[PDB]
Design a protein around this ligand. Sequence first.
Ligand SMILES: Nc1nc2c(ncn2[C@@H]2O[C@H](COP(=O)(O)OP(=O)(O)OP(=O)(O)O)[C@@H](O)[C@H]2O)c(=O)[nH]1
Ligand SMILES: [Mg+2]
Length: 156
Amino acid sequence: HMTEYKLVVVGAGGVGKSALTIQLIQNHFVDEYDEDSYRKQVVIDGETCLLDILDTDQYMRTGEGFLCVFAINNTKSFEDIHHYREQIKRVKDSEDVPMVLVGNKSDLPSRTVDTKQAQDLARSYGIPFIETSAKTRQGVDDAFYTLVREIRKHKE
Ligand SMILES: Nc1nc2c(ncn2[C@@H]2O[C@H](COP(=O)(O)OP(=O)(O)OP(=O)(O)O)[C@@H](O)[C@H]2O)c(=O)[nH]1
Ligand SMILES: [Mg+2]
């Protein structure tokens, strides 16, 4: 009676992958954290979805959609997005994998990646860009829901 979506959250260490997932799962922001996956049931456009979420193998090759996360005060995390996308394109053998680019930590003032750099990168890949804060919860639902919608756009 519900539809499963297998989602994988990738990106450089420290960008807030666990925090974003924990925000989705328990509606709270964890300052310090620690080895498995999470399930969440959520209605998205009138469909009961069971999200199966891996934070950071089986999931990489069977994942249906990817959140590619960098932090907006970590220029290197942003630069490394290319490596994460090439990896995904390799291990799914397609140039057209459901994916959302997420720029996390928007609450922080120390901002070294501009919204234009990020908009440019996402436009080049043909994917949505969503800005988030795991701390304030801004954008978190939006990122996961938009990923579900990209998966649907691609396959039944
Ligand atoms: N201010 C702020 N801090 C955040 C945010 N997201 C995560 N952090 C902090 O950044 C640090 C790293 O967050 P994690 O979720 O552990 O990062 P991760 O990407 O899962 O790191 P790995 O699991 O090592 O790959 C932690 O101290 C978090 O509290 C955010 O949106 N805003
Ligand atoms: Mg993590």
